[PDB]
Amino acid sequence: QIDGFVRTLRARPEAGGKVPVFVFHPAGGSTVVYEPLLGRLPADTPMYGFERVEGSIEERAQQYVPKLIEMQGDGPYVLVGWSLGGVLAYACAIGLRRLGKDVRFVGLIDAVRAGEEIPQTKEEIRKRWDRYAAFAEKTFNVTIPAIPYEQLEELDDEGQVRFVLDAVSQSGVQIPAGIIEHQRTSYLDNRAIDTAQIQPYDGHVTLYMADRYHDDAIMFEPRYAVRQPDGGWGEYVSDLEVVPIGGEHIQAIDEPIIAKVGEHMSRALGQIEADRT
């Protein structure tokens, strides 16, 4: 059921059968979140979930792609993810196509890029932590002292959030490790998107688009308040389909909105199975 970073949501038959759907975890979550989607897909569709690994987006895909090939060979590949999971799916599509594999569906469940690019600069690191501190002051009724910008700006995102958490750890009650680890890894996983080197993809991508990001996403990064019509994928994907699903980002993975996603995705899978036969 769990084998390394691969979760079996529905096992494929011993031989033959329908093409598996490979799903990729969202930041701060596991691939159990795809069970409602699975319920809306055709009967006997296999599904395997890829859980968290370390590195840049590209380095994560360098770990996932060999495992995909061990499981599915030349293809066909169906790759799906919500949020960070969609960026991971896309990176895997890129890696598989480089190896000449047959990728037939890439489904991004509201994996919508920030509407304005996030600068990778010292000034932006200063502005970012200034904003976070302001929100902390209000939320926790404290004043925040001078921020050590020089220390933060030479660290990558993981180093930054680790630095801040370690400063918090110096005083007060000890915070349970599970909470610290969840917050650290969620933060870094979401930030990994910002430094991704997105490559052009020559196949069809389906972007299931919600109406907006939820408030917590925009508190994390204000540039998520703006969405472009192509969700930031049009420059990389000539064969791009957008499927509006309404609601907020955080709702896209759940009933009832996931029924819209599943109805559309079922038709796409149906066509892939028909073409095989």
Side-chain angles (χ1 to χ4, degrees), residues 1-13 15-149 151-196 198-218 220-276:
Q1 210 173 347
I2 303 223
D3 183 75
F5 56 70
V6 181
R7 182 182 306 273
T8 299
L9 285 97
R10 182 181 292 134
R12 73 191 312 161
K18 299 182 175 184
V19 182
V21 178
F22 291 100
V23 296
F24 296 79
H25 79 92
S30 74
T31 59
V32 175
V33 301
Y34 295 100
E35 287 271 15
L37 174 61
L38 180 59
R40 297 292 194 162
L41 293 184
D44 303 313
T45 306
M47 183 177 276
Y48 300 93
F50 280 37
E51 305 291 358
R52 199 182 175 272
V53 295
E54 307 287 350
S56 65
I57 299 295
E58 296 69 35
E59 288 167 335
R60 295 186 194 209
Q62 285 180 317
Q63 291 162 262
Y64 292 149
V65 166
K67 180 63 70 170
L68 286 159
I69 292 172
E70 169 180 301
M71 296 178 68
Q72 183 59 0
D74 292 322
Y77 286 90
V78 174
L79 311 164
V80 169
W82 169 60
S83 209
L84 166 69
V87 178
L88 296 173
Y90 186 93
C92 288
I94 293 306
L96 288 165
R97 290 295 294 129
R98 298 235 48 200
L99 294 167
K101 304 308 190 199
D102 180 28
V103 182
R104 301 261 201 106
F105 187 88
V106 182
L108 309 185
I109 302 173
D110 206 49
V112 171
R113 306 302 308 279
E116 171 197 312
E117 278 194 295
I118 291 126
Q120 301 301 304
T121 62
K122 293 183 172 168
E123 172 80 347
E124 181 64 24
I125 292 168
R126 301 163 105 87
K127 284 187 153 201
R128 174 184 304 166
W129 287 102
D130 282 341
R131 181 191 61 270
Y132 289 164
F135 280 126
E137 290 188 323
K138 177 68 172 185
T139 295
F140 303 104
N141 189 25
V142 294
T143 58
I144 302 267
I147 295 170
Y149 303 113
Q151 286 180 276
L152 288 168
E153 73 194 6
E154 36 162 64
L155 305 162
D156 60 19
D157 296 294
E158 171 170 1
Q160 294 168 35
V161 68
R162 174 97 62 189
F163 182 86
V164 173
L165 288 168
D166 288 341
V168 172
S169 83
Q170 299 305 311
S171 77
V173 173
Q174 285 70 312
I175 304 175
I179 294 174
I180 294 304
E181 179 59 19
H182 183 247
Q183 293 186 331
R184 184 187 61 87
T185 57
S186 298
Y187 180 80
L188 95 88
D189 282 2
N190 280 321
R191 277 291 169 212
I193 299 167
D194 299 350
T195 46
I198 308 297
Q199 308 291 325
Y201 173 63
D202 62 10
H204 187 82
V205 175
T206 304
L207 174 61
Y208 300 95
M209 191 166 279
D211 289 345
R212 64 196 178 273
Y213 275 104
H214 59 304
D215 288 351
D216 282 348
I218 294 163
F220 161 76
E221 168 57 55
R223 288 170 184 91
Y224 281 117
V226 171
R227 298 181 161 215
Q228 303 301 336
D230 69 342
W233 293 98
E235 62 178 299
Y236 305 116
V237 184
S238 60
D239 188 12
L240 180 63
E241 178 186 16
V242 165
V243 178
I245 57 177
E248 302 187 354
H249 183 75
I250 192 74
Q251 297 164 327
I253 196 60
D254 284 325
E255 294 281 346
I257 290 176
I258 197 67
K260 286 186 74 107
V261 176
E263 182 180 48
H264 176 277
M265 194 175 293
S266 290
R267 287 183 355 245
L269 293 175
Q271 185 65 67
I272 290 161
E273 296 299 323
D275 288 347
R276 295 173 77 206

